[model samples]
Target: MELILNEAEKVFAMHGFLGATLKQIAQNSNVTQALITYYYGTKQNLFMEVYRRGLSDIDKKRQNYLDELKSRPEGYNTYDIVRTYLRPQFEHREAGQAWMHFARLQSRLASEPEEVAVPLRKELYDHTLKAFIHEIMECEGEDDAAAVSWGAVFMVSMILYMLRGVDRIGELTDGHLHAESEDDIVERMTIFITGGINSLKQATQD
Candidate 1:
């Protein structure tokens, strides 16, 4: 059951939501088509199942990092914390975190989510987000929830990728941009985002 769900996620990740098929998924998972249809009913439901698992894993990683930091009593370093949070999905490329690929699909659908993405988006990403905002830079009208957490919300929006991958970047820059080489892409993203957030904090202070 779990194997089917994971492979469905992988297949979809590779081929995208529309491009993926149950026949492909069955072949990937080594499960029979009849069993898959009877078990999952529809690709939509199967996707939802995989997405739920992905959400659970994300929250767990989010919370664990927060817990360890607080327990250490050392406090969170903004850059380090951001890097930790950002790299988890990329790290899980091999560990079954297939939902990251949805960033592209979601973007394709009318500038992001233009159906079932609602359920995943609603999960709140846990208290670590609030902790990041509050610890890094707390200002007025702060509620610490996702909607009210501007810093946290902004961070995610930036990470959501205007475009995917270093290859496309290379094309746009026409060989000037290093793309994925030299500096690590995830680190580059994390550092720049944290830098921008801190710059915002600084600008407001002045």
Candidate 2:
């Protein structure tokens, strides 16, 4: 059962929701198609099970990060808020973390049709994302609701793509700028996103 779900995550990561098949998932897990259906009922059900498993893990960690930041005496800044939300997804890449596939799957699914992607994305992230967006708006003193909200959307879009292993910097630099560490990646990412959010301050409507 667990084996099926784990393999299913990888298969789904590569093929995505629309492109993946039960036969492919079963073959990857060395299980019968009947067994997969017996357990998960349908392809959509199995995909949601895989998605939900990782989402729960990521969401819990994100909530804890938010809670910790709120408890801090100094409160939080945009950089801190971004890091708190960004770090866990990257950390999920650490060895033995089965949820790593989720990052890729998320990126792929977001581009899928609205019916397939919108509700699932909202279900997994709306709560935590709103909290982070609120923190960002407060820190930046940007009362422009629309700008801040769109900034949040762009920030998440960048994060999902980054987590999906799109290494444009590496390719562009041609190995000139070495990829030192994940900490460095997170730091740079936070700085970039923080600047992005702050820069939108002037774009707010009067």
Candidate 3:
């Protein structure tokens, strides 16, 4: 079961939901398609299982990060909030190559059919993401829901872009810039996102 999900994850990540095939997953898993069907019953079921497993773990991490930050004596800033939100994916991706592929699978949100992607996204992440945005609002003292929401979207967009473009940074900078490690990415992303949230707050206040 693990072998099949791992292989199916890679195949689905490489090829979006509509493009990936059970046969390809079977080939990658070194199992028969019949075995996959027997275990998952359908391609959609297998796909949802893969998507759910990856997303749910990351969401739980986000929730835990928030839980810890809430008890901080010094009080957390937007940096901490943004870090809490962004660190999970970078950390999870470092666990293995398959997770990097899972990041790609996440980037498929815009291209994947809404019916398949939207509900799962809402079910798994919406609450956690909303909590992060509320954290930003509380830290920044910003009451504008639209700005806070956009800030969250911007942060997610930055994460997706940075995660997907891990290799591009080096080439783009002639080797001067590298995504050397998760801390490096998380630090830069948190700073940038923090600035973005502040700017939005300033704009809304003005």
Query: All predictions: root-mean-square deviation over Cα?
Result: 4.9, 2.3, 2.3
Model 2 per-residue lDDT tens digits across residues 22-104? 99988988889999999999887788788788878877887798889889997777788889888877774457456557777
Regions of model 2 farther than 4 Å from truth: 93-99, 138-140
Runs of candidate 1 exceeding 4 Å displacement: 27-34, 92-114, 124-148, 172-183, 202-206
What are the models' TM-scores? 0.65, 0.87, 0.87
Off-target runs (Cα >4 Å) in candidate 3 are 92-95
Candidate 1 global TM-score: 0.65
lDDT of 3: 0.80
User: Candidate 3: worst 10 consecutive residues by lDDT?
Assistant: 92-101
CA shift at 122, candidate 3, in angstroms? 2.2
Error of 1 at 131 (Å): 6.1
Supply the TM-score for candidate 2.
0.87
Residue 112, candidate 1: alpha-carbon lDDT: 23
